[PDB]
Each structure stands twice: as structure tokens, then as C-alpha cells.
């Protein structure tokens, strides 16, 4: 995937898809008020 290797089974229903779909190259994005006292 650019950095590491991901191991995958080859299932019979995996027939129509590329190999690169099964190793995602990016990680998902996972992303206190003033009150005056005087």
C-alpha cells in the first residue's frame, strides 16, 4: 500500500475486483467559550 504489506485471502467472490482495493493506502480522518466575569 506504499508503506506496508497487507495479506489477504483470495475468495471466489473477489473475482471482479483489483488487488489494490484490498490494501487501503490512506488512514481514515479522525478529527471552551469565553464568558466575561467583569
Amino acid at each position: 500500500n506504499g508503506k506496508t504489506f497487507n495479506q489477504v485471502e483470495i475468495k471466489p467472490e473477489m473475482i471482479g475486483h483489483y488487488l489494490g482495493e484490498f490494501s487501503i493506502t490512506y488512514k481514515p480522518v479522525k478529527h471552551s467559550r469565553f464568558i466575561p466575569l467583569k
Binding site: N1, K3, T4, F5, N6, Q7, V8, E9, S23, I24, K27
Partner: peptide
């Protein structure tokens, strides 16, 4: 009389899945 106490007297993931893919 003072005493000679110089010190204190008181004592769910598949097998081949990488950490990235996980």
C-alpha cells in the same frame, strides 16, 4: 547533652491484516 546523630534518628483481527489496514 547533645547526641551524636549525624543522620536523622527518625527512620477481532484476521491473521494477515496489517496494523495499517486494521
Amino acid at each position: 547533652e547533645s547526641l551524636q546523630a549525624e543522620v536523622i534518628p527518625d527512620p477481532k483481527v484476521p491473521k494477515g491484516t496489517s496494523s495499517y489496514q486494521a
